[PDB]
Amino acid sequence: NDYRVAVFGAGGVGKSSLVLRFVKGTFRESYIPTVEDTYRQVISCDKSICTLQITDTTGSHQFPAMQRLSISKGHAFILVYSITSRQSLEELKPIYEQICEIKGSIPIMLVGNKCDESPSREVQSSEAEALARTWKCAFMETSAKLNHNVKELFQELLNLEKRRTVSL
Numbered sequence: 001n002d003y004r005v006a007v008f009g010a011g012g013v014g015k016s017s018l019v020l021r022f023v024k025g026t027f028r029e030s031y032i033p034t035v036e037d038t039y040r041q042v043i044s045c046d047k048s049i050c051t052l053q054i055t056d057t058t059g060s061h062q063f064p065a066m067q068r069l070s071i072s073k074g075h076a077f078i079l080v081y082s083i084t085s086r087q088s089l090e091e092l093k094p095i096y097e098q099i100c101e102i103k104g105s106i107p108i109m110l111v112g113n114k115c116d117e118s119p120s121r122e123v124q125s126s127e128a129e130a131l132a133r134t135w136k137c138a139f140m141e142t143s144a145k146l147n148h149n150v151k152e153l154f155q156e157l158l159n160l161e162k163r164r165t166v167s168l
């Protein structure tokens with residue numbers, strides 16, 4: 001019916017911004033906290049058309065049940081951190097663990113956002129690449145602000161899907 005992608009990460013890393021750049025083409029400098037939003041986009045699925053549903057989650061820890069349900073229903077996951085915050089990278093570890101616990105063949109992308117702020121970088125790409133290796137997932141850096149690697153993010157994620165032929 002649909003192909004479901006969920007986006008996780010700490011508050012302020014750019015989850016909403018990556019999703020909005022991809023789906024709507026827009027960017028805002030203002031921070032607007034999210035509870036849980038979803039967006040649909042028409043994509044190709046096998047020799048037919050379906051929707052991609054993207055779930056933009058919260059970085060609040062106050063909704064653990066909601067977060068577990070979002071993991072359960074997702075087909076593919078994007079784990080976002082900010083290259084300017086080592087703490088935001090560390091905060092993805094428990095999320096990765098919950099995906100493994102609940103899912104027990106799953107596209108997963110580790111994404112270092114805000115790569116336009118390389119001068120204030122705290123997480124070197126080499127370190128995030130090492131983590132992605134241990135997690136056996138893909139890695140890339142993005143900038144929602146610059147529209148750097150935003151289309152590529154979703155293209156690469158759907159290309160990792162081998163249980164279904166999904167593309168943009």
Ligand SMILES: Nc1nc2c(ncn2[C@@H]2O[C@H](COP(=O)(O)OP(=O)(O)O)[C@@H](O)[C@H]2O)c(=O)[nH]1
Binds near residue numbers: 010017029030113117
């Ligand atoms: N410099 C820069 N700022 C960004 C980027 N992506 C998001 N932001 C900003 O970071 C703040 C949090 O973005 P938001 O999308 O709401 O993050 P979320 O809390 O993870 O959903 C906002 O002020 C955005 O303008 C980016 O790629 N570069």
Ligand SMILES: [Mg+2]
Binds near residue numbers: 015016032033034
């Ligand atoms: Mg948000």
